[PDB]
Amino acid sequence: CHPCPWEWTFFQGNCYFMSNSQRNWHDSITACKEVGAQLVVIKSAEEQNFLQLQSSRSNRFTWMGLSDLNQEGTWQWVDGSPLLPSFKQYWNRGEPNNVGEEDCAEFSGNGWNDDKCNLAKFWICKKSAASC
Numbered sequence: 001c002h003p004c005p006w007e008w009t010f011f012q013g014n015c016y017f018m019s020n021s022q023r024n025w026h027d028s029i030t031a032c033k034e035v036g037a038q039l040v041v042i043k044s045a046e047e048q049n050f051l052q053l054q055s056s057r058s059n060r061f062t063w064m065g066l067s068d069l070n071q072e073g074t075w076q077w078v079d080g081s082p083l084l085p086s087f088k089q090y091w092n093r094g095e096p097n098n099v100g101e102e103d104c105a106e107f108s109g110n111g112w113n114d115d116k117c118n119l120a121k122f123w124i125c126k127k128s129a130a131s132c
């Protein structure tokens, strides 16, 4: 028994996978569903730091499961949960700025950016670990 599939990273009871290819935001959602996972929904500050460190180290602009597609300026996770005020700190300086209509969130440098959902980026999937 092992908690996560091969090539997935265990962190605090969940399993994470960073892609090696690039897709747009909606196709990244589909990619995670196909492996029994979800485009990453962040639930804690420690989880944010863990994910941001990997995006920063790898120098990969990476989608997360967050959008303001339903209501411009109101950010919602793909599981329906709202972006809480304790997470506004992670936006990069000047973000979100919706320049040229940007409705999907990415890890970019040290924080988050809103970018065009049609752009191809890396993505991270998350699913719960098995108990061994």
Ligand SMILES: OC[C@H]1O[C@H](OC[C@H]2CCCNC2)[C@@H](n2cc(-c3ccccc3)nn2)[C@@H](O)[C@@H]1O
Pocket (backbone or CB within 6 Å): 061, 094, 095, 097, 099, 102, 108, 113, 114, 115, 116
């Ligand atoms: O336009 C894509 C992103 O360009 C920059 O971010 C860098 C990219 C690098 C590739 C991965 N995504 C992040 C940031 N930017 C653009 C502008 C801006 C403002 C007014 C007029 C013209 C441009 N201000 N800031 C982000 O806000 C943008 O979303």
Ligand SMILES: [Ca+2]
Pocket (backbone or CB within 6 Å): 068, 069, 072, 101, 102, 103
């Ligand atoms: Ca919009």
Ligand SMILES: [Ca+2]
Pocket (backbone or CB within 6 Å): 068, 072, 073, 098, 101, 102, 103, 104, 114
């Ligand atoms: Ca927007």
Ligand SMILES: [Ca+2]
Pocket (backbone or CB within 6 Å): 095, 096, 097, 098, 099, 102, 113, 114, 115
């Ligand atoms: Ca932006």
